[PDB]
């Protein structure tokens, strides 16, 4: 039960002038913060998004980011001018930052930077560095970003101390939302597929771990194709399992669904 905290940033630069930066923050599969370009301040999307920080501690932290966002926008603009005409607009930059919480007050922080949808740069130790696969021209940006000692000290304190502290508080304040149990509802349906395809729908369950198999009596069908986990708007999950069968063979088949919320009483739907 190791929760990963993710501060996702997306920045788009269309030309020299026009740009926008939007962020979202995840603790596991729950959104905690939102920061639209239009908004001057970071928005809580949960009651407990402030964690265990005081109002004074949060203001300090928010201000750090407010300066960051404006600063970052100008830096990228200047870095483009520096590399010009090697690299040109439009430019897409993504940041994935945060810390992965382990038991026994253990964690591991990270700050990954993608450029045009490719992971090129990370903050490691006490400096920025390129990763394997990165183009060599980024060495000048990296040299320049590593010149700024103030930024380095700040990010170090942010990744080493501030992240694990904050996230450890989040886990306490948002315990009831994190550990919530939402029950799945299931329903059946069928379509042709080159031979019909039976579909077992499972919707409205939390947390994400779930077990869904087609069965005839007590015989797990090997042809059961589990689909992707699709989200609902109310922060519950949707999954479907399909089984390809022949016409007149649908009789006998059932869809069994196991989930922690149901607590023993598995859902069994017969065709």
């Amino acid at each position, epitope marked *: 039960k190791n929760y990963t905290f993710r501060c996702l940033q997306m920045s788009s630069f269309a030309n020299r002038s026009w740009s926008r930066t939007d962020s979202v923050v995840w603790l596991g599969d729950l959104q905690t913060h939102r920061w639209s370009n239009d908004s001057a301040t970071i928005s809580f999307t949960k009651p407990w998004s402030q964690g265990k920080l005081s109002n004074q501690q949060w203001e300090k932290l928010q201000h750090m980011f407010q*300066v960051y966002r*404006v*600063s970052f926008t*100008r*830096d990228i603009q*200047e*870095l483009v*001018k*520096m590399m*010009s005409p090697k690299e040109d607009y439009p430019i897409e930059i993504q940041l994935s930052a945060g810390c992965e919480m382990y038991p026994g007050n253990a964690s591991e922080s990270f700050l990954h930077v993608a450029f045009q949808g490719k992971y090129v740069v990370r903050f490691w130790g006490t400096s920025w560095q390129t990763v394997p696969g990165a183009p060599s021209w980024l060495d000048l940006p990296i*040299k*320049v*970003l590593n*010149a*700024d*000692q*103030g*930024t380095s000290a700040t990010v170090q304190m942010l990744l080493n101390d501030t992240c694990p502290l904050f996230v450890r508080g989040l886990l306490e304040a948002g315990k009831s939302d994190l550990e919530k149990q939402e029950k799945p509802v299931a329903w059946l349906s069928s379509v042709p597929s080159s031979h019909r395809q039976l579909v077992c729908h499972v919707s409205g369950f939390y947390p994400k771990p779930v077990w869904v198999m087609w069965m005839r009596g007590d015989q797990e069908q090997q042809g059961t194709h589990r689909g992707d986990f699709l989200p609902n708007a109310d922060e519950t999950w949707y999954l479907q399992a399909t089984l390809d069968v022949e016409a007149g063979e649908e009789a006998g088949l059932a869809c069994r669904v196991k989930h922690s919320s149901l607590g023993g009483q598995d859902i069994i739907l017969y065709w």
Partner: T-cell receptor
Amino acid sequence: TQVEQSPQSLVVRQGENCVLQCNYSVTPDNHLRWFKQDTGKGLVSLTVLVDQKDKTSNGRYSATLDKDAKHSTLHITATLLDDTATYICVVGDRGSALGRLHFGAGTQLIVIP
Amino acid sequence: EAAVTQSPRNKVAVTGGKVTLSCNQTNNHNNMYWYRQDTGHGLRLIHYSYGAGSTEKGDIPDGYKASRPSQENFSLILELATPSQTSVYFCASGDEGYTQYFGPGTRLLVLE
């Protein structure tokens, strides 16, 4: 202008001390540099302040910075005739070449010998 | 001692004339900068360059063209000089750090 200096000008007698003020609104504020400009000549760096509550010294020149207040002062102890100059306050908004320098208009010091 | 030189150091020009302020730097600095100094104002940026071939607009670029033919030389070109461009012009250079090393200045007077 994001960098204001005070006083605009002042006159002192040789041997006396003076305090020069710099107040800025630059955001962010990485470092602050004090220059000396003799009449006609170029810019001579006296000191550079980087920390949140920094103090520096350079012989007769000492300076302080408080980033919370966005305030810095240059102290000249025991003024000599050669101190007759303009004293310029510059704030840098980055710790790298990506930074823009924000210049004060200066403070004219005259030392009566 | 990263030194920077400017030429000319002092220049008298006529309105509508062409004036070229040069700046040489042997420190192998990628970055060079052009400022002018006027009373009531601090130094104001005109043009800067991040390397040979690059020129970028400052805060007050109007009436000036920049030129970075090499790593060493950065020129400020007044194509059609005007009295308003009477000033003291300072060139500077620097590496990836925040420090800019300033030249000794150029006094330009533009007469009618």
